[PDB]
Amino acid sequence: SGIIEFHVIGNSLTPKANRRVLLWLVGLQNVFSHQLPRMPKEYIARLVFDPKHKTLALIKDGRVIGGICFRMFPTQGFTEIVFCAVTSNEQVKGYGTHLMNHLKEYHIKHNILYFLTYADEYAIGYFKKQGFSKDIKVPKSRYLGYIKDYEGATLMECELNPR
Numbered sequence: 001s002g003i004i005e006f007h008v009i010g011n012s013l014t015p016k017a018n019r020r021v022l023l024w025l026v027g028l029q030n031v032f033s034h035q036l037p038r039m040p041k042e043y044i045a046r047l048v049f050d051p052k053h054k055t056l057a058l059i060k061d062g063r064v065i066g067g068i069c070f071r072m073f074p075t076q077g078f079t080e081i082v083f084c085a086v087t088s089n090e091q092v093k094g095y096g097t098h099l100m101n102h103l104k105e106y107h108i109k110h111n112i113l114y115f116l117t118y119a120d121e122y123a124i125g126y127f128k129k130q131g132f133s134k135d136i137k138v139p140k141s142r143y144l145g146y147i148k149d150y151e152g153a154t155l156m157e158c159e160l161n162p163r
C-alpha cells in the first residue's frame with residue numbers, strides 16, 4: 001500500500017465476519033464522532049453499523065482518515081449523505097473534495113444522480129463547493145420520511161452531471 005485507498009464498506013448483517021472492515025468501521029465511527037462533536041456517539045455508531053447504510057472510507061496506511069456515510073434509495077432516485085468528515089490533521093489538503101468526487105463516480109455508475117443532505121450552517125460552504133444547493137429538485141413527497149431531518153440544519157441537494 002503506502003498510498004490512500006477508497007473502500008466502500010459497511011455491515012451487511014453482522015460486523016464480526018470481517019475484522020478488517022470492523023476495525024475500519026470503528027475507525028470511521030471515531031473519526032465521525034471527533035469531527036461531529038454535536039452528534040451523539042451512540043447515534044453515529046447506530047448508523048455506521050446499520051446494514052442499510054454504507055460508508056465510503058478513505059484509508060491511508062491501513063488507517064481511516066475520512067469518509068462519507070450514506071444511504072442509497074434507488075427507487076426514490078437519490079442517496080442520503082448522512083455523515084461526512086476528514087480527520088483534522090488531514091483536512092485542508094483536498095481529501096474532502098476527493099471523497100465527494102469518488103462518491104459521485106460511484107453513484108453515476110449505479111445511476112443515482114441526486115444527493116440529499118442536512119448541512120450544519122458552518123459546513124454549507126463545503127457542500128456548495130461540491131455543487132450542492134439549497135434549491136431542492138427532488139419532490140418532498142419523495143424524500144419525506146426517507147431521509148432523516150436534523151435540528152437547525154439546512155437541507156441541500158446535489159444534482160450530478162453524468163457528463
Ligand SMILES: CC(=O)SCCNC(=O)CCNC(=O)[C@H](O)C(C)(C)COP(=O)(O)OP(=O)(O)OC[C@H]1O[C@@H](n2cnc3c(N)ncnc32)[C@H](O)[C@@H]1OP(=O)(O)O
Nearest residue numbers: 083084085086091092093094095096097122123125126129
Ligand atoms: C451531512 C453532514 O455530514 S453535515 C457535517 C459535514 N461535516 C463536518 O462539518 C465535519 C467537520 N469538517 C470536516 O470534516 C471537513 O472540514 C470537510 C469534510 C467538510 C472538508 O474536508 P477537507 O479535506 O478539509 O476539505 P478539502 O481540502 O477538500 O476542501 C474542500 C473545499 O471546500 C471549501 N469550503 C468552503 N466552505 C467550507 C466550509 N464551511 N468548510 C469546509 N470547507 C469549505 C474549502 O475552502 C476547500 O476549497 P479550496 O481547496 O478551494 O480552498
